[PDB]
Nucleic acid binder design. Structure first.
Lengths: 146, 148
RNA sequence: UCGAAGUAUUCCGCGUACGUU
RNA sequence: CGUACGCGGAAUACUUCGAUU
């Protein structure tokens, strides 16, 4: 009850809005770099503002009703790819997940949105091992498709 | 419209899983449904008594707005059985079916597949369908090419 | 991009009931 | 596996509103 409580998802939602550390444990190893409204609006320079070359991608990790979110900037380059692929890993997710799972199994989700295409991997807490190994390949592909 | 009963076309698309069909409703899938019966499913869970290994098949769906199609195909993780299930739908079969329920105003399109208690879903506006396909067809490949 | 409200869907988890039409 | 609801979430599409003078 304490775990999975609304008192913890609120902190997981607010965890996004910190520099390199928020009061609780997070699955991500990189900071959120979400753009301000103005920096996004000014993202109507020479193109449409959402379809072809966006400023980044949005990814989410959920363990039950405990959801973490991140916006990372992806310059469509191999160097920037290697940078965003390390936003999370098997150990970071399980470590975080161990802090909100146990007892009765719940629903876990990883979601990623890029170029108007959303990809979501969903399964039970006991399949978290298989979700991660699939979330990494799905993510790697979504970011290398043209 | 859709028309004129907007929900009746959704009603036929769900029945397409069972009938031919039937009908005349164009489907995005090229393979018939292979859903096991209740008994056949009760007994398949008795050889290697378990809950997610081995599975008799997988479940996949295509949604164009509220017009949803669904298939359950048998899959034994052999190369011969992988090439077939990969033929469940091609890029043209989905675009062909998509052209039948999509207009000018963009709607929500989805592809889903559940295998070994793992569900993968590809969602986006109907204007990115061509992109959902390339991303969905191979996302279907990796899900069926893994091990416990 | 952030937040909130609504509408139409999709998906996962848990629980209940009914099943070779 | 199929069907119907219940609960808790996630994702997408569309609409509206708000966002350092």
């Amino acid at each position: 009850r304490a775990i999975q409580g609304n008192d913890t998802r609120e902190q997981a939602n607010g965890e996004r809005w910190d520099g390199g550390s928020g009061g609780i444990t997070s699955p991500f190893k990189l900071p959120d770099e979400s753009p301000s409204w103005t920096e996004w609006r000014l993202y109507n320079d020479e193109t449409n503002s959402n379809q072809d070359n966006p400023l980044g991608f949005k990814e989410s990790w959920g363990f039950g009703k405990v959801v973490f979110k991140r916006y990372l900037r992806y310059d469509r380059t191999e160097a920037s790819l290697h940078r965003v692929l390390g936003s999370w890993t098997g150990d970071s997710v399980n470590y975080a997940a161990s802090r909100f799972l146990g007892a009765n199994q719940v629903g876990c989700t990883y979601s990623i949105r890029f170029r108007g295409v959303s990809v979501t991997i969903s399964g039970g807490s006991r399949t978290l091992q298989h979700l991660c190994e699939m979330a990494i390949r799905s993510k790697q592909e979504l970011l290398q498709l043209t």
